[PDB]
Amino acid sequence: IVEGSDAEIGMSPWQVMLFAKHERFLCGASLISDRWVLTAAHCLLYPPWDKNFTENDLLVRIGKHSRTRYERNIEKISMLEKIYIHPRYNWRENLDRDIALMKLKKPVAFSDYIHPVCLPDRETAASLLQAGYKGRVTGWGNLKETGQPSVLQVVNLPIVERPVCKDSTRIRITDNMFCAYYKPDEGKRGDACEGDSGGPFVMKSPFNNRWYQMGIVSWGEGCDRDGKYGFYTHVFRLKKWIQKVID
């Protein structure tokens, strides 16, 4: 996270760290129930860099804060039973449908530091996914593009209008993505960076006071560059697929 600040203890209890069991910090993710983790497909399967991880190569670390520290009597480390990648994840061009579910071997016990995020319903997506509204990104990713934090970082960012997103890049944007970040003349700055991928873009409903995961950190061109925006997977557009695999 660039231009963010330290998270408070327990501020993002759904935050998950993907960790190679060999160790290195692979990506972020989020806890959506006692047995299911949500992340970006590119964290697990990306052929251009020869990345193809299976269930036996990874560990999920939940309830963390400190990036490098094992945090006993707080974090919980779980093994994976099965990984599910969206069938139409397009790693060859776009990163279109950049989403994957991970089923844990055993349910994790919730605590003050471990608790799941909600998934949006159509009405929540309709009222909150608007240009100008801010969501929050969290992660242990790099602090600058070209440098790693000691603790979980947080930044709040505004969703950008679709025409502005489309005109900032040469990549073809789809309806399964949205972009967020400040404009060059907006004064403030901030973004996801290497290592933040797969983590959650969340918003707090003013209707029922619950936190909702609207996006998944998917890709960017550099980090915190003027005129460039962070691109996120649109969780609500892929919600039927999620519900189907979970069943």
Partner: peptide, 10 residues
Amino acid sequence: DFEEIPEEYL
């Protein structure tokens, strides 16, 4: 860094 994690997680 990365402090080692218990061997149970393997």
